[PDB]
Write a protein of this length. Structure first.
Lengths: 220, 220, 220, 220
């Protein structure tokens, strides 16, 4: 009756993809999430999805903290929820990507967490922890490990300017990025530099992907 | 001990109309509501009621979010509560109306929900979902399906102006409405245009109803 | 393990006066209160106490909502807590008073409640409901029944001015009062008019009491 | 499954030092803390730690209320959490200190609490209660008993000026201090007066300690 995440939902007998209620350890009121019950056995809890550019992702700090969009479409679950999920157990991250040629690729990370040991995850900037890559899209996230989350109105990056504003996104920017999945939905090749839905290791710095989905599942 | 809504209250043995405590899935602290234990078998949870114009309904965003008025009289349960109720199960909507000639009519909708898949229902504007009409008052809500909630201080409608201000109410306005149950209590026929407690399909655009009650009950 | 109030605490075996944890129905996190386990069998939950003028009671709306002072001394439990307590069951009110001549008296009310049917008790002003008097101090509260709570910075009374400011207190003012237990601790007879810790029916309008305690216990 | 503090965690079978989830009585959502499972039998819940000056401790009221830093390094658990912990049972305080010569000392207090009887601990200033000293570092906290917590932006001390600003810290200042563990990490001897990580009874008023850790464990 109180699954902690999508894997619990799956193990309880729910095999279909869809929206379900989960109740993280330190977020007892619970909330709804979209569950991917197919990928590599299923049981993944989605926290990000781009697919048509219908939702504006160039949002400020509060929106990225609380979440926006809709579970059945493009959305960002919200950093407070991602933190509540990732700190209750050891999780891995799966990232699915797709270009405008119907081609697809993915990146899997053995460990993933946000503000794992932060007393106040929000004030500490929801620092990213991620490692152990494997997949077909190549790694475009490891260099971001250890970085705080930065938005257009809250700079915690390692650049003289605001990476989020500069690359029109919101991410665990360093100086500045190798991945920018919350960037502008520019739809394919574009002249501007690395300010679209980018995953450099796969499609470079000037190609805004058509689809992306970030999700997690207990490592053990 | 922890009914999720008025139907649970009824099924537990409480047959009288009145105020009871309910505890929605993602609103564990719970809150009180007025239960209609008579209508078509009973078990309806009320979230809106007009009956004498003693309460001001031309309120702003925060009031419509948190609720106002009193459970035993005119009131609006609050969008955050309606969301917590409607997303925990599939509900239908029953609307009771009465004119100043003691005549009455109703509208029943097979499905009803507010911000059903919104990650942050408040930021997403508590979008309305409603369908499958049947009744005696005629349908005045279907054209509103899919619309966000709009108040005098937060415009999310499809009009060049602010529908809530223009028609002195708060509703899931399009451009602008076919129903306006949270409008001014003008008491019957009135010269102003569609800015009273209107339900066009039944009493037209220039007649402010004497009584209205909106309530929900699990569909299945 | 989860008493709803001081009577539950008593019935569970705790016979000594002191501070205990209680968990109201719609306030699951719970909070601490001072329990009077002696008065007429014991089991009273205190929400107000004056005894030495060490605490400032001429506070604003937020302070009266959230509470101030200390449980072991002068304090105001806070309207949000009083509401959570009184709406979970039918309670009666007991008021103990003492003048500077060591004389004492009391007022008992068969029914007592704050914002009992208010959808949003705070926005509705935590309206007072009280009736059925009996005792030795005389009745100085019945005329206040039905009134909202008023502070120096939030006027909901029936006076052309702000009763709270005028009589230096915080109360369910009408126009203005017969009781003013949250008034200034003027210590006995005073020239100013009715702006001290007054209970008119007993000591008049120009005598600030030395001690007062307001508490509740389930009626049934 | 729901330990109230680090002692419960230990008694349940967890013998290693590390981060664990605890769920205080009036803070049911729970939060994570660092547990010291070695000191005098183990079972201590840490709420403060200095060790390298990597974290800024000259913070304002909200930061000291909500907490900052990281559980695995320098941090302040947050006064709201310390209050939730210390009011659920009788706790004692253990303070470990270390200078830059690798020397160490400690102070143990038989009783410790923050805002123990405050109706609104935050508005009341999280007053300190502490007594019964024993140890090797000498007592530098007893004179602070009874004092409210003061930050650079919220003065509740007994000085004509703001002790927190003057001594660059945050503490239960009187006029002003004998201990200042949240002071500037000045690293050893320093010319400025008592504005570093000081514990006067041991290293005087002009020596900023290298390491400090404050923790609690149920007295009984
Ligand atoms: C996308 C991104 O962050 N690019 C880096 C760096 O790799 C580029 O060479 C540089 C060009 O100005 O901008 C940046 O600092
Ligand atoms: C009540 C309401 O929303 N009326 C519509 C439309 O049906 C009317 O014809 C029009 C008249 O200006 O106003 C509106 O845009
Ligand atoms: C204490 C109090 O509220 N007194 C009333 C009324 O009884 C008095 O006669 C009047 C005198 O101005 O003030 C008031 O309006
Ligand atoms: C650290 C501290 O609080 N010192 C006290 C007092 O002991 C000193 O003598 C005095 C010197 O001005 O400052 C202070 O008021
Ligand atoms: C790509 O896939 C879609 C369905 O997902 C299909 O309709 C389309 O014809 C395919 N080809 C391209 C290049 O769009
Ligand atoms: C209407 O009904 C009320 C009672 O609900 C009754 O008192 C009244 O006489 C009836 N007729 C009219 C037109 O008011
Ligand atoms: C009143 O009672 C107190 C104890 O409560 C006592 O000390 C005192 O002598 C008594 N007389 C007066 C008038 O204070
Ligand atoms: C002090 O202890 C550390 C290890 O904790 C050690 O490396 C060092 O050599 C010791 N001596 C000094 C004075 O640093
Ligand atoms: Ca920057
Ligand atoms: Ca508009
Ligand atoms: Ca007034
Ligand atoms: Ca001062």
């Amino acid at each position: 009756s109180r699954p902690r995440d999508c894997l619990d939902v799956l193990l309880s007998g729910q095999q279909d993809d869809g929206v379900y209620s989960v109740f993280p350890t330190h977020y007892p009121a619970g909330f709804q999430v979209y569950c991917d019950m197919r990928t590599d056995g299923g049981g993944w809890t989605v926290f990000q999805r781009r697919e048509d550019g219908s939702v504006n992702f160039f949002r400020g700090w509060d929106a990225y903290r609380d979440g926006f969009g809709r579970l059945t479409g493009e959305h960002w679950l919200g950093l407070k929820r991602i933190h509540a999920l990732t700190t209750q157990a050891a999780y891995e991250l799966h990232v699915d990507l797709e270009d405008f040629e119907n081609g697809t690729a993915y990146a899997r990370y053995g460990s993933f967490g946000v503000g794992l040991f932060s007393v106040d995850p929000e004030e500490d900037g929801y620092p990213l922890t991620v490692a152990d890559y494997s997949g077909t899209a190549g790694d475009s996230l490891l260099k971001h490990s250890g970085m705080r989350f930065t938005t257009k109105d809250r700079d915690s990056d390692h650049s003289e300017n605001n990476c989020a504003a500069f690359y029109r996104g919101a991410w665990w920017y360093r100086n500045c990025h190798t991945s920018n999945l919350n960037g502008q939905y520019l739809r394919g090749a574009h002249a501007s530099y690395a300010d679209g839905v980018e995953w450099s290791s796969w499609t470079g710095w000037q190609y805004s992907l058509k689809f992306s989905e970030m999700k997690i599942r207990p490592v053990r």
